[PDB]
Symmetry: D2
């Protein structure tokens, strides 16, 4: 499992359940080609997006549908979505965890990168 | 002054000087069209991007060039940039401050919105 | 003005008005002795806590009353307060801004330090 | 396991290894009585601090020795430590995870509270 996403709710103090996540890779013509997708579990985590064989060097984008989450809770949000863009595997393969912390008018995202 | 951007360095505890910022608006055909650009000053702030007349209701994108900032200091960071996307002025005119706080493997962003 | 405090609400995207702030210094016998206090203004800022003369080298503590802010809006938050502890002026006089960003189950804090 | 602590490094993109953590409970005379302590693992996590029987209602403090961590890495820090103070179990027992994200001049702390 070379890529995993984990999401938390700063208002309720809970994992974010059933939020949509889309992944893209950048093409030779500089457009974004769809690659993988899913929804977060009851623990706020999304596993099984790609394999070591498929996840080659390149530029990748992760898009989290934050607006649909806050609408479902009846709270008014600021952003359309939350986005992370990064270069992968420049020094060999690694395992990547993308962590996001969510509030209606503010978010943070951190990468935890291992061996 | 209806749109302002402010950037800080969380390693040194200081404002971030000469950082590039580009702004786009969503067109009727779903394309991103160039709206404004500039660089941060000594206080880490960028003023005078637009006017109340020009800044109509729509979806806007603010892209901050965080990779060039880190590379100039000898560091290879995680992110390519920091990007913020939002609907503006849908309940009438407002003033917007977009703030960003930077680390090599993390960033946070916050919006302060006031009624002029 | 060598010490300033600024507070924001991350649910509403707005400055936080009338929030209580207390400051203490560590005494030679290891006790905390009261140094200054005040409340935030309409812009969420608190100015004029001390002077360059009075603000000597030492360990300082800033306590922000976040529980009362949330309770006044009908909310029962996680934290009792937000507290920041730091050594000041150990390489000569500097200006300090202490910023805090508030959610019911989370807070972040940042220091901006400049050479006057 | 009613209480666990997890810590991350925003400069290196890694868990924080071997950082000291102390826990206190507030006494009738308003002083802080020492309760439990330990160090974070290779995954940045600290388990086994207390039990359901011992962890009764009250006000608790968690202190993380952030200054010693940054000194060991040769980077100059702002804060003496990072502190979280909270009331526990007011509506019955819960499981509490205290998560902290660390930079030299800035930190955040979030609570994840379950059933």
């Amino acid at each position: 499992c070379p890529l995993m996403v984990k999401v938390l709710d700063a208002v309720r103090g809970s994992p974010t359940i059933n939020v949509a996540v889309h992944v893209f890779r950048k093409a030779a013509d500089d457009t974004w080609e769809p690659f993988a997708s899913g929804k977060t579990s009851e623990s706020g985590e999304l596993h099984g997006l790609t394999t070591e064989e498929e996840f080659v060097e390149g530029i990748y984008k992760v898009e989290i549908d934050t607006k649909s989450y806050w609408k479902a809770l009846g709270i008014s949000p600021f952003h359309e979505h939350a986005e992370v863009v990064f270069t992968a595997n420049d020094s060999g393969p690694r395992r990547y965890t993308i962590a996001a912390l969510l509030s209606p008018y503010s978010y943070s995202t951190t990468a935890v990168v291992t061996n």
